[PDB]
Design a protein around this nucleic acid. Structure first.
Ligand SMILES: [Mg+2]
Ligand SMILES: [Zn+2]
Ligand SMILES: [Zn+2]
Lengths: 44, 56, 147, 134, 181, 49, 30, 266, 114, 391, 65
RNA sequence: UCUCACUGGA
């Protein structure tokens, strides 16, 4: 429930699914569900 | 593409899998309660009329 | 599932006379595959078992804060001072012959997770249930016994 | 059903490379000079270091079918050497016109035996025993 | 943190100090010196990525500030300081994990897609979900009959209230083939 | 041990996801590709907040 | 001496006062 | 004597420890297996609840009720409710328990083992006493409740062994280890440099001698000199469980002979 | 649903012979007997005392599958010897050693403190 | 569903405890696993339908695979490492266990074999009691490197009719291999003899594993002390090499060969020297380790893992990556604020120094989190595009 | 919750030990390896039950009749 | 009574 609260959406072979170096310390660098929502939905 | 080249069927069974090596290569372990509901309509045959009437 | 991606299912079950046992007379509850480890390299699982053993024996609790300076040599000295093998090994016994197994056993406790996806929640079997109206096909969905 | 061939050897090197129980050995030929034996021996029951004297005998006989337990009251056997092993020859590789080397397997073990006057002795027989004392 | 050298000890040092931490320890004992008081004291600095464009942090303040005027063989390797002008300081880099991904005992050794699998799975863990469970009228609650705190205690579980409300169990595990299952 | 952060809409505990986008009102320049007469294009989103 | 250079274990208390000042739905409440 | 000699060392009320020498390997193994699994025991099986407003579930509380161990000295004269030819339970195949615990003291009203009262006529049998092994004489921590809450039961306890369940196992972690100084080569220890220094000098090394390093390898010896440490819950004392276990093992081998007499006549 | 009658590991249903005995087609005087509702305990015990004799040449047990509770044992004795008599000598050696064990252990229970 | 073998047929053996079984060496070509992955069940309906499925679509008819003319099945992880430990020469067996396994084979001839060691005592080099499983009329020969009939390694093979003459049993015999023993069995006899081969080898190695055991643990991960010291000084000399070529880049005197500029001609040299040092240190670790290294035993089995896997778990993790490149600055001039600006040290460009044993400094942890999330990107796009290209 | 009756591996009861161990901690505050050595769980796989087990029963029973 | 939306698993 807590991770569901601190979760982030984004609408639209490309760069935004990556783990950019600006996410360091802000985005959880190891959380995203599988499937087509991989790489995009993020958590803090 | 949904109803003409392969559809949802009858006489179907879907579950989880598990392993065992004590079975053999041409063997699959079906649950007993599927066996109580998966069935086969075989014709009345004199070759095992006793066993088929015993089943019914 | 475990806590590091070694998820799996309950293969088959025994009771304790069939289940193995050790030189202090304890049994494990859940044994895993030794080939499940060295591909995915989840060394976290081994270190969790080992430090959990040291902590749950000595009474204190293992520092699971991640970027600390805990060494396997540290857990080793603290385990050998209790008196098992320094890397954590043991000797278990077979449940049928009771023979000393020629190799050893690595042993320890670990927090395990029950998650969802039960066997009575993935089972599905249809032998001529009711049909549709438009296509009159076999229906879909478990709660009306779809194909 | 007789003793096929007997021989007398010294030992130069036993080689326990990579191995706890099985160990290869090399024969020092304190005989006629032709005979040479390399042999995997099981040193778990047969503690053998260098420079022993070994009387190696082929002995395909005890004067097929199941094997009964060896019934420690009495048996008909030539067993009273130290070392009774069982196996199979496969191929007698031609190093001919001066020697014939023989190559045997004991269910998982290796025998190479050299020399030349046994040009009539051995065979590709299924059983081919081994009997060593000392 | 803020690590300007505003003290005459020589080289650069912290501005946060142990007496402020001890006043915070009195604030622990209250359970007057809040994090707002820490802000108004001028000790911690709210930084975004845009302000992170032009800084140079130090990670461990009990490592990275002084110079070397012996080593543990079974320990990890920290790199160097190829600089001197550090401006801010990491609180503890074990905060950069998420809610679910910090429940991991020892993520210092994995292969990181396994951690991703942990973040996927650990959501689905089932046990205690809340405390008012006999009062609520919600669908698909999965109460464990016997909860258990884990053996691994990362201190993020403490403020995370995981060690107060868990959702699993321990068991004993061995790792050897037993009967081919 | 509830901490909240969630509404109640008709009894449902619906929870708003923090959304994510890029504003204008900041310098934006691109490198547009071959199907164009543009080699580089600057942009604002002149969106009145 | 109150002016000591710190260890990381002080920062755990810093986070302690931080979280038990705010909570965890901080941006929702903000 | 002739065969299995028993040389009992340190013992207690609930600890046995004994050199069981000149016995066979699978004999020892079969003995520890039958004493784990194959001993009948009274414990609570059927549960009928009248009313409950406690914080725990009826099924959860009934599961604890089943896990309560009672006194099982007199197991031999209690029938199975399957082989008893009555109407589903009687006073020779079943043990009825009745428990009503109400709370009004307004600070953590408790419920423990010693609240159980055997309302069923026990016919003068040493059965059904809830085993207060407690130092302070309370029992297992059963339930916690307040004013309006209430604990109302009607339970029936029956027989059975540790193979139906774990609730009919009084066995509790029975050990077995022979031959520490391994002359039998049944196990080579994992080692980097030296197993004698790396692997620890084990516990039962006092009685059999250190294996006299300079000897060649013995092959003849079988499994001898076993040191089996046993334990119990306390439903029966630790001698009577070994008694009833060897008795049931002897009875099942007599059942093999029963089947042989079934065979060779018909 | 699929958890069976759990008492099938030791007890029966309707009409099971607790043994089933048959000859074998490989060697002279070989007999396979299956035993129902037992386990590796009884199996290893019977096979361990059956190992000792010189009047037997082969005897071996196994279980088929740990779902069901039945397990087999095959014995080839020597010529003329009844393999069921090999069984009888072995199991009364079993009752011999069990009774001698019960005597020795009860005596050392009584002849010791508490 | 992806190939001819993606569906098959097997006989029914009704059980309790509702799962679907399968034998553990038909779970390889199905590409399933025991994580709860799901399989369906279609029951054929007419008499001739049953005849068609039973006479074609059963597994022993499918065994040799048309995919790349090899066998698609074989022997997998636990059975495989067990048969790898078993056919070692040391595996001496007692009497009654030979009796027990020979009943365990479901088609024993009732022949107690002659013990290869009878010196006083009846023993067996367990390759021979494996040979009673292998049926008649076989030959194979491999001659791996210097296997000329006097192998000092027992690597290779030789079979006659179901008598293993010498050699271990591993993946390149009992698995999916080109000169597969299963392949030779199917060609020389046929499918039902192959189907019984699988049952024999499976249950024989099953019983031997149940009463021997095979484990692994951190003792299989930790190398010896001075060799871990050699590993760390080897990576130190690797950083000496990258330090010299960086200081040669500072002087800008770098002879860029044609194909790339000076910077990328420097980059390929850094990456090549780095990974060459990685695999040299991995070989140093792998020849450090001894026979009782269980994960090394699983490597020579070929069940899971690789020399790269033991190299990662002991010597060094190596080099993270994103999209073919090493780590490039999402910021300007640096990958992380803990780093200086304009760093072409490998430590900012994405080298990781220690293996999983000693741990992860958080910069390395972030690099590795990128290197794994890249792989999750590639599965979450390639399932879609390979599914369209398939259909 | 409650400490489980018959700590799962061994099955020796330890749910008797909880109130005495509670007053042993609140009354004497030792190291719990010694405290459980006083309440006598010699094997660590059963020492884990008392070292681990979390009660939530009091936070349950705060609520309401 | 199902259409669509969004989650969930592989
Ligand atoms: Mg899957
Ligand atoms: Zn009755
Ligand atoms: Zn326990």
């Amino acid at each position: 429930t807590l991770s569901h609260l601190r979760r982030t959406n984004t609408p639209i072979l490309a760069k935004p699914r990556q783990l950019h170096n600006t996410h360091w310390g802000l985005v959880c660098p190891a959380e995203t569900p599988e499937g087509q929502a991989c790489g995009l939905v993020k958590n803090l | 593409r949904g109803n003409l080249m392969g559809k949802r069927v009858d006489f179907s069974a879907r579950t989880v899998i598990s392993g065992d090596p004590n079975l053999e290569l041409d063997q699959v372990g079906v649950p007993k309660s599927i066996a109580k509901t998966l069935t086969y309509p075989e014709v009345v045959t004199p070759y095992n009329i006793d066993r088929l009437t015993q089943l019914v | 599932a475990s806590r590091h991606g070694q998820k799996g299912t309950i293969g088959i079950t025994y009771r304790r006379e069939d289940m193995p046992f050790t030189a202090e007379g304890i049994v494990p509850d859940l044994i895993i595959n030794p080939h499940a480890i060295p591909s995915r390299m989840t060394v976290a699982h081994l270190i969790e078992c080992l430090l959990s053993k040291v902590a749950a024996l000595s009474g204190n609790e293992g520092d699971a804060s991640p970027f600390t300076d805990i060494t396997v040599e540290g857990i080793s000295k603290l385990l050998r001072e209790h008196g098992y093998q320094s890397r954590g090994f043991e000797v278990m016994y077979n449940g049928h012959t009771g023979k000393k197994l020629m190799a050893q056993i690595f042993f320890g406790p670990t927090y395990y997770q029950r998650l969802r996806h039960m066997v009575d929640d993935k089972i599905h079997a249809r032998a001529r249930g009711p049909m549709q109206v438009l296509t009159r096909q076999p229906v879909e969905g478990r709660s009306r016994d779809g194909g | 059903s007789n003793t096929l061939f007997d021989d007398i050897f010294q030992v130069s090197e036993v080689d326990p490379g990579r191995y706890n129980k099985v160990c290869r050995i090399e024969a020092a030929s304190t005989t006629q000079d032709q005979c040479k034996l390399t042999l995997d021996i099981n040193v778990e029951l047969f503690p053998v270091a260098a420079q022993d004297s070994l009387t190696v005998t082929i002995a395909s006989s005890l004067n097929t079918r199941s094997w009964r337990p060896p019934q420690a009251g009495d048996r008909s056997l030539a067993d009273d050497y130290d070392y009774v092993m069982y196996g199979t020859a496969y191929k007698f590789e031609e190093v001919s016109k001066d020697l014939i080397a023989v190559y045997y397997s004991f269910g998982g073990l290796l025998m190479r035996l050299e020399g030349n006057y046994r040009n009539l002795n051995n065979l590709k027989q299924e059983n081919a025993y081994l009997l060593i004392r000392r | 943190f803020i690590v300007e050298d505003d003290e005459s000890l020589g080289h650069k040092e912290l501005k946060v100090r142990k007496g402020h931490i001890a006043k915070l320890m009195a604030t622990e004992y209250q359970d007057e010196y809040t994090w707002s008081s820490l802000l108004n004291e001028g000790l911690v600095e709210y930084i975004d990525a845009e302000e992170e464009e032009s800084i140079l942090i130090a990670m461990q303040p009990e490592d990275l500030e002084p110079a070397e005027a012996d080593v543990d063989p079974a320990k990890r390797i920290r790199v160097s300081h190829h600089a001197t002008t550090f401006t801010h300081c990491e609180i503890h880099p074990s905060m950069i994990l998420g809610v679910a991904a910090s429940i991991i005992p020892f993520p210092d050794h994995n292969q990181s897609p396994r951690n991703t699998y942990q973040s996927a799975m650990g959501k689905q863990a089932m046990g205690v979900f809340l405390t008012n469970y006999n009062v609520r009228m919600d669908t698909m609650a999965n109460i464990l009959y016997y909860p258990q705190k884990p053996l691994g205690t990362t201190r993020a579980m403490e403020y995370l209230k995981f060690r107060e409300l868990p959702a699993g169990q321990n068991a004993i595990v061995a790792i050897a083939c037993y009967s081919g299952y | 041990f509830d901490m909240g952060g969630y509404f109640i809409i008709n009894g449902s505990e619906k929870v708003l996801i923090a959304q994510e986008r890029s504003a204008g009102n900041i310098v934006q320049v691109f490198k547009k590709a071959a199907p164009s007469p543009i080699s580089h294009v600057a942009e604002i989103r002149s969106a009145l907040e | 001496d109150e002016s000591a250079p710190i260890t990381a274990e002080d920062s755990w208390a810093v986070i302690s006062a931080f979280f038990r000042e705010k909570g965890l739905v901080s941006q929702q409440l903000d | 004597e002739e065969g299995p000699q028993v040389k009992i060392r340190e013992a207690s009320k609930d600890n046995v420890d004994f050199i069981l020498s000149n016995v066979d390997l699978a004999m020892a193994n079969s003995l520890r297996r039958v004493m784990i699994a194959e001993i009948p025991t009274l414990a609570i099986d059927s549960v009928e609840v009248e009313t409950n407003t406690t914080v725990l579930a009826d099924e959860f509380i009934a599961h604890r009720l089943g896990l309560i161990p009672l006194q099982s000295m007199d197991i031999e004269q209690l029938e199975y409710s399957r082989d008893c030819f009555c109407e589903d339970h009687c006073d020779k195949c079943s043990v009825v328990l009745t428990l009503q615990a109400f709370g009004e003291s307004e600070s953590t009203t408790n419920v423990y083992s010693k609240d159980l009262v055997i309302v069923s006529n026990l016919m003068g049998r040493n059965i059904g006493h809830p085993i207060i092994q407690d130092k302070e004489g309370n029992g297992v921590l059963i339930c916690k409740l307040r004013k309006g809450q209430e604990l109302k039961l009607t339970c029936v306890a029956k027989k059975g062994i540790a193979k139906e369940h774990a609730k009919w196992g009084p066995a509790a972690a029975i050990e077995f280890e022979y031959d520490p100084w391994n002359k039998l080569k049944h196990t080579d220890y994992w080692y980097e440099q030296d197993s004698a220094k790396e692997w620890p000098q084990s516990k039962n090394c006092e009685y059999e001698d250190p294996p006299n390093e300079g000897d060649p390898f013995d092959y003849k010896a079988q499994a001898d000199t076993f040191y089996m440490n046993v334990e119990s819950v306390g439903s029966i004392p630790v001698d009577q469980v070994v008694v009833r276990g060897i008795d049931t093992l002897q009875k099942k081998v007599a059942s093999i002979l029963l089947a042989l007499t079934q065979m060779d006549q018909d | 649903m699929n958890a069976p009658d759990r008492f099938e590991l030791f007890l029966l249903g309707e009409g099971e012979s607790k043994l089933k005995i048959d000859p074998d087609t490989k060697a002279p005087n070989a007999v396979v007997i299956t035993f129902e509702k037992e386990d590796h305990t009884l199996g290893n015990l019977i096979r361990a005392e059956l190992l000792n004799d010189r009047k037997v040449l082969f005897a071996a047990y196994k279980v088929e599958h740990p779902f069901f509770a039945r397990f087999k044992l095959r014995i080839q004795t020597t010529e003329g010897y009844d393999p069921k008599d090999a069984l009888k000598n072995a199991c009364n050696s079993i009752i011999n050693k069990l009774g001698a064990l019960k005597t020795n252990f009860e005596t050392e229970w009584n002849l010791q403190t508490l | 569903s992806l190939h001819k073998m993606s569906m098959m047929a097997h006989r029914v053996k009704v059980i309790p405890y509702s799962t679907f079984r399968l034998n553990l060496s038909v779970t390889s070509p199905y590409n399933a696993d025991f994580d709860g992955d799901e399989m369906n069940l279609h029951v054929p309906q007419s008499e001739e339908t049953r005849a068609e499925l039973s006479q074609l679509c059963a597994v022993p008819l499918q065994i040799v695979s048309p995919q790349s003319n090899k066998p698609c099945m074989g022997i997998v992880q636990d059975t495989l490492c067990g048969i790898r430990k078993l056919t070692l020469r040391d595996t001496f067996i007692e009497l009654d266990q030979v009796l027990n396994m020979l009943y365990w084979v479901p088609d024993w001839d009732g022949v107690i074999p002659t013990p290869a060691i009878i010196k006083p005592k009846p023993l067996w080099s367990g390759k021979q009691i494996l040979s009673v499983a292998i049926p008649n009329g076989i030959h194979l020969q491999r001659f791996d490197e210097g296997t000329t009939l006097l192998s000092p390694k027992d690597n290779g093979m030789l079979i006659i009719d179901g008598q293993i003459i010498f050699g271990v049993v591993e993946k390149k015999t009992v698995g999916s291999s080109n000169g597969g023993l299963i392949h030779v069995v199917t060609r020389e006899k046929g499918p039902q003899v192959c189907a019984k081969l699988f049952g024999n080898i499976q249950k024989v190695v099953n019983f031997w594993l149940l009463h021997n055991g095979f484990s692994t643990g951190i003792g299989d991960t930790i190398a010896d002390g001075p060799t871990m010291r050699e590993i760390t000084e080897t990576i130190a000399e690797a950083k000496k090499k990258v330090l010299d070529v960086t200081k040669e880049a500072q002087a800008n005197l770098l002879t860029a060969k044609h194909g790339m500029t000076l910077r990328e001609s420097f980059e390929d040299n850094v990456v090549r020297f780095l990974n060459e040092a990685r695999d040299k240190a991995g070989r140093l670790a792998e020849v450090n380790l001894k026979d009782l290294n269980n994960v090394k035993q699983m490597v020579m089995a070929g069940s899971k893992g690789s020399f790269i896997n033991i190299a990662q778990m002991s010597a060094c993790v190596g080099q993270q990556s994103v999209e073919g490149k090493r780590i490039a600055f999402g910021f300007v001039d640096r990958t992380l604020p803990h780093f200086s600006k304009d760093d072409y040290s490998p430590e900012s460009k994405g080298f990781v120094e220690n293996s999983y044993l000693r741990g992860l400094t958080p910069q390395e942890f972030f690099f590795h989190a990128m290197g794994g999330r890249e792989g999750l990107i590639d599965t979450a796009v390639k399932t879609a595009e390979t599914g369209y290209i398939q259909r | 919750m409650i400490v489980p009756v018959r700590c799962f591996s061994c099955g020796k009861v330890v749910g008797d030990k909880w109130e005495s161990y509670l007053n042993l901690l609140q009354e004497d505050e030792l190291d719990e390896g010694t405290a459980l050595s006083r309440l006598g769980l010699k094997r660590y796989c059963c020492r884990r039950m008392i070292l681990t087990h979390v009660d939530l029963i009091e936070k349950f029973l705060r609520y309401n009749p």
